[PDB]
Amino acid sequence: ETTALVCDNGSGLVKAGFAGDDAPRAVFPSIVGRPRHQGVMVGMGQKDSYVGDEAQSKRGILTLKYPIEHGIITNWDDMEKIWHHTFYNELRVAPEEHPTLLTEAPLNPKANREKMTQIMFETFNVPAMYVAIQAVLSLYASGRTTGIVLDSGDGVTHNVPIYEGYALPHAIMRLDLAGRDLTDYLMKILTERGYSFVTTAEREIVRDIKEKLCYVALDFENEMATAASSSSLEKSYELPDGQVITIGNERFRCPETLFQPSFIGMESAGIHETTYNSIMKCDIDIRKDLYANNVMSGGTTMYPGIADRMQKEITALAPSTMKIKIIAPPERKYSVWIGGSILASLSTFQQMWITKQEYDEAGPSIVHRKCF
């Protein structure tokens, strides 16, 4: 009778809702904003902190902080504020009568999961909770059991291969390059045309420009030559103060760091090379079934050129007698949450929760013996 809750706490967005539904009920940014200027009018309900869309609307007088960086919760009072906001104000529920399913990136610190368990059991005390891997939930939402998931969000980009319900944890790859790094690189290369975005409020403007105007080039050198020849690739964007800026090659130089990390000084290889190395680290008899089942999930995989570029690069890397298929659904921005809405709804899952009695018996160390 008790309805389970599915909460996906990424680095940039919080997607929370109920199990068994199709879409998340509450999608809001994971920001806590605090005032930085001098308040002069008395009273009028001035608050010392702002969470979510209220922090985004008043961001001209606020300093915005993200509690999670690179998939790791760095500030815990702000994370308590985020969880209190998504339980009492957005979802409008009482957490003492709802089990909770949370998500986590692979190769994370164990103390993050231990403190998530301790805070969910001692502050918002739940009957049950469970922490799950996001790529497994993406594979649940895809409707299949075999595939290699490339999940790229705001802090982490990770590859997880799964064959017939069995994961290969030695081939799991994690890269700390995601949409916030692309936002910072776009902020850096916007100064070549004279545009200066420095403050934490203007990072959101640069993120909006990246979401609206950036795309992935199929050929990088041909697109650079096309931009250098004619002004057919230039687009205009209107700033909130009415200013109009114009960008050319910076539309496709920004997500190219996903394929050339050396643009931001990283020594690692691209996401296509990471996916190929994750496939080639698996057993030989499963690789074919991986090659036809490349699944992309997350916001950073939402550029309108990325599936064709990934297919071209993997087809260049793979032998020619193999079929390479990139699976990009239109709902892949929320796919992890949809997997939670599947996984908490299964009758075979209800014995996998971590109850309060088990937490009192074992402490906050049962989350490693219970969750993978």
Added chain:
Amino acid sequence: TALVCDNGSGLVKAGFAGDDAPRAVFPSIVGRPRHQGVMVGMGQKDSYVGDEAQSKRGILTLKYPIEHGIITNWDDMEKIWHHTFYNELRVAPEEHPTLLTEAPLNPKANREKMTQIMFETFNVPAMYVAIQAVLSLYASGRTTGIVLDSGDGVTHNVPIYEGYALPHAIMRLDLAGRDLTDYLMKILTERGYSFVTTAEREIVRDIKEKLCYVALDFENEMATAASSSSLEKSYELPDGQVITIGNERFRCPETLFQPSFIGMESAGIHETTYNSIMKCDIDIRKDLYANNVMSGGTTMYPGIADRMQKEITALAPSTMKIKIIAPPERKYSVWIGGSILASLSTFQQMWITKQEYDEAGPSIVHRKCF
């Protein structure tokens, strides 16, 4: 309707007595999971038997219950027999007498535990145990001759005169297709290919079944392979990679004629056959030389009959006629001979029934059975 089951070291060939071909031919492997299961909307078993193992071997560790002809694991043999009776044949073992096969020169406790398991767990009205090379001679339409039975675990040379095997001339060589698969895995490291896992052992087995052959003259074949690339052949891996082998095609089966390639003390199959013939009386040696019968899958290399003819002609006296019979269906020849034997009229009183097992115990198979 009787049941004929050939439980080889590498394959299981089972069917009904009277049919001309086996109905269930599947690998004798048990696969178990190796990695961490993360999805709960799945069947999620713990043991896979047969082709279901071969369709899932990339996440599985494979085990053979039979090693070098003798049964090492009896729980896995129970699983093999259960899958044979209930999933591949769709029969009830309470209604059908079952014929079983056994390699010659084997420990007696293997037959003891075979009869005990077949009468206590998979209860049959009757059962019988037969020698494989005798059935392979029976399937070829003759009653006198020498059978070279080479399979997955053992190679045997059995001479049979007037339907009776001669036990003082039965020769056993502990070299068969599993050792050839492992030797091919060892010698593919020279060209840079690494095969370690039990799943890749099946890939190398497929390579051996597809590309290898027997050279007529080994030194001349090695000379021609080192002169030009006219013997190189290509194979496409399951992941799309292309490998090329030039002289491993004939070096791997040469262990049948030179067993020291894998470090075994015994002589080759030609000397083994000549020794098995030469232990017999002089008046039957002409019939044994004229009736050489090949059997099993390891005799399916496309050069083995001519090479065996050349070597036995070299060993034998020059006035002796050497004829080697290699039937095209010799991969299924123990089963066909068992089908012929189980469909005979007078064989029906040679069944070991359950009442005689109750009155005797797990030792009747050494008195009523051979």
Added chain:
Amino acid sequence: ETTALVCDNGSGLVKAGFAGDDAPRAVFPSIVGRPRHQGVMVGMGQKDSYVGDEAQSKRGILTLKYPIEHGIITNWDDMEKIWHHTFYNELRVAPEEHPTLLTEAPLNPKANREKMTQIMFETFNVPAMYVAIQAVLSLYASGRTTGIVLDSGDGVTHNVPIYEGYALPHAIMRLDLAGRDLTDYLMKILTERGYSFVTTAEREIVRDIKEKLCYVALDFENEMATAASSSSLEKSYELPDGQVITIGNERFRCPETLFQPSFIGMESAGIHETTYNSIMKCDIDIRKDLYANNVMSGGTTMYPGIADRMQKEITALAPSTMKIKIIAPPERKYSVWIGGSILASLSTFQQMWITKQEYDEAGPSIVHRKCF
């Protein structure tokens, strides 16, 4: 007076010197470093590549490559640079007056040995060269003639049984699990405490941590229990930037992969089981002398718990009436080189060289005729 050179080209280190000496004169890493950034100051040297210790000195601005992976040379131009820096910079000799002795792991590709012979004879042109197995040189240095040698370095762990100078080829076993895989596994499991190491320069730091702090437990489960029970097995290490890390139970989980290869996803058996299988593939009358003369060589056999653990495991596998003695010399990090100098200083080895005229007559295939 043409003294011979003994050069051991491992996967991680190069140990080179003169025959007759008791210690290698040049021990340096087998790396080539190339710049990953741009040079803004002019008037310097600024060479395009760095070999050996100079690559390790400025590894923060270089990406590092190993020309030898799992005992097999993959990059041959980098191996040209390594051998040139060995002959002309670390030894200061001209390799036209010294015959050379090289080492190779067993069950290697034939093209590696053919190309080594070719590059020795018409690039660094030598009067003579020989290629020898490493484990027989370890037994030559150990002073015995019968026994089974476990050589474990940076790329290949191999077991070779030798009876009265006869290497037994059908019981030689090879595993591609060595110290580099251990370094990668420690790099992976260091992310549980939050320590993230990504670049190729940080792999050297993790290798230094492994060399300083890791050890082999006698009983793994009791060690895990006492690590979880008390904070008495923790140790601290200082990074180059001054930060301090602490590891408690990663010290014995990292070399547990040598005994449980399933930690990195491999299906193979442990080194103790490989040793027992190598002994069981020998003749039945020589297994007593092989069980009494177990010799450990290489750098991965330098953990300070490995001899007692190997003794316990082999005594478990062996029959109860057998005597098991495992010999670990204190100088076993350089044991292939010492036996190589012993072999090259012998009077009856002077007919076993491959001369230049023989290479001219027979081409680069006489190394399969004159060398084992």
